[PDB]
Symmetry: D3
Subunit: 149 residues, 6 copies
């Protein structure tokens, strides 16, 4: 049993031109790219994405920072939702562990390069929000026998 998580490179990842490095970290574990799309995030979609924060004082500033180019991604793998969260590291980069994306690339939570789903429920919701069903691609990795038990 594999699962799928929603990962999104934020505008700072695009603008600092580290998209390839981010993708490589997930490919390195044999996670499969099931979907990928460059878009420019808009306030209306971001308000849905961040619905859990509705009415909170920091939400307007969060939406402003995210209004820009983003790379929407779906990666598939064993326990990938929780594992991708571990790979990203703490929301605050100063607290994140060395070897994680936020620790290795970033300084502050408001520019922390990447978003990943926090749960199976949120991954399903986020994938549906950002991707159309036909944009999720089903194929098998050739090295599957050497990646999976």
């Amino acid at each position: 049993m594999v699962e799928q998580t929603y990962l999104m490179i934020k505008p700072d990842g695009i603008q600092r031109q580290v998209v390839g490095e981010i993708i490589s970290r997930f490919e390195k574990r044999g996670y499969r790219i099931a979907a990928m799309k460059l878009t420019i995030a808009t306030p209306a979609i971001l308000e849905e994405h961040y619905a859990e924060h509705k009415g909170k004082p920091f939400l307007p500033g969060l939406i402003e920072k995210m209004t820009g180019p983003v790379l929407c991604m779906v990666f598939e793998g064993v326990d990938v939702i929780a594992q991708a969260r571990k790979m990203m590291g703490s929301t605050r980069p100063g607290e994140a562990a060395p070897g994680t994306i936020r620790a290795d690339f970033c300084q502050q939570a408001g520019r922390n390069l990447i978003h990943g789903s926090d749960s199976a429920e949120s991954a399903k919701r986020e994938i549906s929000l950002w991707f159309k069903p036909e944009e999720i691609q089903s194929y098998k990795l050739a090295l599957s026998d050497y990646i999976f038990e």
Copy 2:
């Protein structure tokens, strides 16, 4: 004065899991990602993509190799069409220069990891074939003053 080229990671680039490395090579020069999407190429679109080879005996082999997951990309930069061709290297990896993608990653022309547009006209045609206009994203790189004269 910048232009845009169509670059497509072929199924071998997906399956060998070098997508991030490929993207990083173009980001390294300050080329801007104007569009990106993962799809599974169909014979119908591939026949149009390779229309110049219609009626040639090798065309079905071109289509069969490409019938699989691909990463469609548009990169923007100065002289990017010709420069991306130089970065990919010769169609036959054995004839490509060290430091090019095909020489660094590949052995044979039928598995040469990546496609790039040949010319201004073919770039325009290929971008329109593989992307809808709403999928092309316009934004400015923050480091523009240090990339461009």
Copy 3:
């Protein structure tokens, strides 16, 4: 005072073609390659290597997965037995720390890329199993004065 440990790249490390990357991680700390040999592991030698697991339900599957090309290695360094174990990370990649081999490359314990000795006793036994004394090479690293206190 240096010691030596036995490290073995498993068939998944060979087939995913990450041998050089694995070796570089150990070279990076100034560990010295004292022995190295590519072989195809057989059930007979694998049963002796994994003798502590005879009678366990997982042994037949472990032997099957290990019956393939392997890279046998001996590395020398201060505390290298325990330190290589730390560098590999937990047997289960999902529990391994960021920056370890298993966390960076793998998903499941049954395909976890590499073996390393767990103790001085096991290192001595494993080195003797896979290498004859004449295969252990003694030389001094040129940068020794800058590696060892």
Copy 4:
């Protein structure tokens, strides 16, 4: 909005193992700004002042001897950079340092642990002044600031 500056010094082992660029890249990767950088050869006299906290301890003479050689003096600027650089360097003893840190990734023993970084705000001010003249510290703004800082 508040950044600080720390003193980081590549020790002679970092120079001789020719990993200076890799070390610098690790700090550049987080958007830390190079405010000062110079190659020098450390002398016993400056090392005794740098390591004044260890005066009288038995290990000090050997520490000075190993540090007498080429070093790269550096000042990096960023949010919480003093403590952050210590996190990135890892434990003084490489065997105790976390994977992904400089000491764990490159080193074996504390006496050859590749790099020094200030341990506090007071030590950073003292060490920056000790090793650098004021005119060697450069002020400029990173073009990527809007995407590094909140």
Copy 5:
């Protein structure tokens, strides 16, 4: 579909010289050949001695530079066999010119080295030399036959 066509493959003898061992760039060198989907068919660390080096460099017998070459090469070496399409000529192209200063950027010798006498790596110059060098440095049972799982995406 995606399955490869049959191609004849070659095997070349590549040897990391003592400078490659001592500068601790073994992994980086191996990665360059793995990156193209070349298969490791054999690999062994040894210490090269004058007698075996004299046979390795038999074409240089009696030449005045041979003694110094043997001295440089007396030390730890990594013996390797890599397999791939046209791998003998391709590996030579990847190593670059004998003189690193003449080697093309992106080759091993241009990227790592300064002078011919410390140029990090040896590779066979022809099929006949590869057969002879492999026999010199490896026993027959040390050559391993297996197939790369990514063959359908490495080979056309």
Copy 6:
């Protein structure tokens, strides 16, 4: 017989934060850092540095782009003046060979990341211009026996 060349990372190399990568390319060949200093280039020193272009119409724009942070460097090696020029590649990145700094990082001559001396006479003049004598450091690389014949 070794020589010394003057290499200078231009403001675009500082601002794109590729200083470490540049330094690593020269360290990779066993070139010795003999001197290194971060400064801010002024028009007065830049006019002397570019004295050969006195009176030419492009000189004011060149000076303007170079007025910013720069990393002054001296590297020592066999034939290092010519070799560093080869490693940088053509002044115009579009003409530069794959694997060179300018081809790998840059798009246009006006933002081409790095300067290197063009001759022994220019290297001696440029080192004297940008460094005080006491800033040149004399020491021997411990890897010398494995770098030099």
